[PDB]
Amino acid sequence: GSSKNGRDSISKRLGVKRSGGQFVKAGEIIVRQRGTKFHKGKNVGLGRDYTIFALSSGKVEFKTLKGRKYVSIV
Amino acid sequence: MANKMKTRKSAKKRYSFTVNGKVKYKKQNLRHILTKKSSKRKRNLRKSGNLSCFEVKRIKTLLPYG
Amino acid sequence: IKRKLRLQLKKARFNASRSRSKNKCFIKRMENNRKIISKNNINVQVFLVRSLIGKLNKKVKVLKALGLNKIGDKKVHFLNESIKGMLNETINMILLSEVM
Amino acid sequence: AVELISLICEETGIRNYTTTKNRRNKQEKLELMKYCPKLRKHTLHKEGKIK
RNA sequence: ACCUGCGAGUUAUCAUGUCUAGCAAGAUUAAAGCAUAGAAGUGCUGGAGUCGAAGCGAAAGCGAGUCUUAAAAGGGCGAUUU
RNA sequence: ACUCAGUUAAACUCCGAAUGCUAUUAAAUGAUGAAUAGGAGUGAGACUAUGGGCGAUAAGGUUCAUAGUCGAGAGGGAAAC
RNA sequence: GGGUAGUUUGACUGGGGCGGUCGCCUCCUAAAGAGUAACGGAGGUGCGCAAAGGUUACCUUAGAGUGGUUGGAAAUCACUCUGUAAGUGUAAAGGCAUAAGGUAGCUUAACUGUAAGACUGACAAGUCGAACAGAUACGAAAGUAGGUCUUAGUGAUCUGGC
Numbered sequence: 001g002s003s004k005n006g007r008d009s010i011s012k013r014l015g016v017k018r019s020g021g022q023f024v025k026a027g028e029i030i031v032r033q034r035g036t037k038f039h040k041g042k043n044v045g046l047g048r049d050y051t052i053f054a055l056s057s058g059k060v061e062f063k064t065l066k067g068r069k070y071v072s073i074v
Numbered sequence: 075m076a077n078k079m080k081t082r083k084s085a086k087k088r089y090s091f092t093v094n095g096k097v098k099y100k101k102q103n104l105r106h107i108l109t110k111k112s113s114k115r116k117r118n119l120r121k122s123g124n125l126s127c128f129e130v131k132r133i134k135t136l137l138p139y140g
Numbered sequence: 141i142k143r144k145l146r147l148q149l150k151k152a153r154f155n156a157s158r159s160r161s162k163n164k165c166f167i168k169r170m171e172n173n174r175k176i177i178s179k180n181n182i183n184v185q186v187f188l189v190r191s192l193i194g195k196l197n198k199k200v201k202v203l204k205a206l207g208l209n210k211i212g213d214k215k216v217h218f219l220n221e222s223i224k225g226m227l228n229e230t231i232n233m234i235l236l237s238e239v240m
Numbered sequence: 241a242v243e244l245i246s247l248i249c250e251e252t253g254i255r256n257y258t259t260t261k262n263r264r265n266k267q268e269k270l271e272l273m274k275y276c277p278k279l280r281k282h283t284l285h286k287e288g289k290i291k
Numbered sequence: 292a293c294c295u296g297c298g299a300g301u302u303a304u305c306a307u308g309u310c311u312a313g314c315a316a317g318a319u320u321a322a323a324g325c326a327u328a329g330a331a332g333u334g335c336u337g338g339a340g341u342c343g344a345a346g347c348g349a350a351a352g353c354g355a356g357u358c359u360u361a362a363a364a365g366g367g368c369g370a371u372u373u
Numbered sequence: 374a375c376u377c378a379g380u381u382a383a384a385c386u387c388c389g390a391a392u393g394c395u396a397u398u399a400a401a402u403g404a405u406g407a408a409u410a411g412g413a414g415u416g417a418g419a420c421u422a423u424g425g426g427c428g429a430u431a432a433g434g435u436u437c438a439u440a441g442u443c444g445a446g447a448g449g450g451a452a453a454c
Numbered sequence: 455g456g457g458u459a460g461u462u463u464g465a466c467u468g469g470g471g472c473g474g475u476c477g478c479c480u481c482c483u484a485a486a487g488a489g490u491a492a493c494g495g496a497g498g499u500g501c502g503c504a505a506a507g508g509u510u511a512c513c514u515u516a517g518a519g520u521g522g523u524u525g526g527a528a529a530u531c532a533c534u535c536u537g538u539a540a541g542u543g544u545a546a547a548g549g550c551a552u553a554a555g556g557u558a559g560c561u562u563a564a565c566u567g568u569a570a571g572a573c574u575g576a577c578a579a580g581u582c583g584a585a586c587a588g589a590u591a592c593g594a595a596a597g598u599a600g601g602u603c604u605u606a607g608u609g610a611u612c613u614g615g616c
Contacts (some may be wrong), residue, residue, distance in 0.1 A: 002473065002474045003494075007478095009606085013573080013574055015393085017487095017572090019600095026571060033548075034604055036548090036549060039526080045584070050603085053572080053573095059395090062609060079306050090422095092346095095504095096368080101578095102578075106611090121359070122367075126576085138306040143433080150451075194442070195441080196439095197441080215447090217401080218401095259498090259584090272562060275589055276566090276589095281590090
């Protein structure tokens with residue numbers, strides 16, 4: 001009577017790639033995620049798989065509004 | 075001349091040398107079933123690439139003359 | 141006698157065989173060190189009195205950042221927030237005297 | 241029940257595109273306005289065989 | 292078993308790196324010949340060939356540019372600073 | 374089903390640390406960083422102090438995470454170890 | 455055609471064998487970056503869709519209570535409370551009120567040549583990507599559109615065919 005299961009996928013390495021306050025240049029990846037765990041603010045864009053990336057050079061910042069987190073470049 | 079080091083022909087037919095060290099090669103996965111692969115993927119697979127610097131020493135051993 | 145129990149017992153006896161006089165000396169040293177650290181902007185002389193062998197990696201890195209590599213190491217430092225934090229991390233392995 | 245079809249430029253006959261289509265669902269003759277790179281212009285492409 | 296002898300990274304060529312010696316945008320001869328000697332030498336003769344001096348592109352071909360392309364429009368591989 | 378009071382949950386979370394991780398600045402510590410070129414060896418770990426899973430909150434058991442030690446470390450102590 | 459000859463018939467495995475398993479995706483184990491084992495504990499998968507795609511415009515369930523021919527606890531409709539628990543082709547998770555939910559019109563960007571700058575990573579690979587040129591689709595226009603809300607639906611090289 002062997003084990004009926006034991007099966008796991010490859011870890012996808014999600015999470016925040018640039019920390020709030022760090023300096024990024026155009027096109028950087030900031031967050032990798034499934035779904036808008038973090039939403040888009042000023043000067044960032046959202047990829048087809050909800051990746052957060054920087055449209056211009058600046059400093060990352062996270063804000064909170066009504067309990068939702070927004071990423072921006074300032 | 076009794077013992078000239080033989081080149082590895084199957085490697086010669088796939089590797090190329092640039093002037094200052096790098097190795098040029100043709101990317102894989104653009105030889106076969108292609109309908110499902112996205113257009114931008116195929117376009118990137120068409121253009122040739124350079125190998126990582128970690129294989130260059132072994133390749134230089136494989137191609138003693140080229 | 142069962143090996144599990146005798147190993148536990150031997151370890152417990154070694155641990156419990158510490159001398160209260162030595163503990164009191166250590167307590168006195170700790171009190172002195174905390175009193176000195178509580179000051180602000182003085183030149184303090186730091187002696188290293190406990191070895192680096194076997195200690196935590198983080199603490200070895202802190203001590204090498206203070207400049208002490210051996211027991212008997214002497215270094216004078218100016219107490220600001222950075223040095224105060226390092227001294228607090230490694231308070232149990234140092235002896236602080238004050239440079240009048 | 242899904243076959244690989246090829247979309248053919250009407251006015252050149254080049255097999256510009258390939259796609260998937262489900263047989264036994266329409267059995268029609270799918271037409272698609274696709275861009276024909278030979279002409280630098282969009283045009284009509286019709287379903288056709290691959291091999 | 293003890294003791295004493297014997298008992299294992301060598302040679303020949305190619306690739307590549309470093310050191311030493313020499314020349315230098317050039318460097319170098321291989322086979323082989325002649326002369327003297329009898330002294331399996333070493334002084335000449337011998338430049339056929341190889342490696343640099345331009346690379347890029349599958350190739351044609353073009354060239355400090357070349358290819359991918361209508362595009363030096365952006366890049367890939369180069370370089371003007373060997 | 375509803376109200377009051379009191380409880381369980383690694384695959385429940387209306388809330389949420391302490392540490393750790395990341396960025397900047399000022400001190401502090403002096404070849405510990407990085408790149409290129411040449412040359413390896415290793416790809417059997419073990420134990421202890423913690424956080425775990427499996428086992429039977431059994432095993433000097435098996436398999437992960439942090440740190441140390443042995444490994445490759447003499448000396449002193451834990452009777453030998 | 456075992457008359458005879460040359461060979462193959464795997465590995466992981468709490469010894470081996472038997473049994474079971476081998477790709478990929480979702481969650482926990484996993485100790486609040488990432489990563490992190492097991493024959494640890496639970497599921498799905500080798501597709502479907504010419505719309506279930508793109509664009510524009512317009513809209514919101516489920517449940518509780520109440521009143522109505524079939525109609526009952528429950529089918530359809532009205533209202534109150536509730537405010538996403540409903541629903542997102544397909545497993546689960548993360549997300550989705552500006553709805554990514556639903557309806558309708560038009561339509562094929564389910565494009566070509568490309569790409570600054572990155573994540574993940576031994577390598578080979580994989581993924582995001584502003585913006586540029588040509589040709590469009592939709593909208594008055596700004597803009598969006600390089601398939602499917604995202605995360606599985608897949609296979610190198612060699613050889614051969616069109």
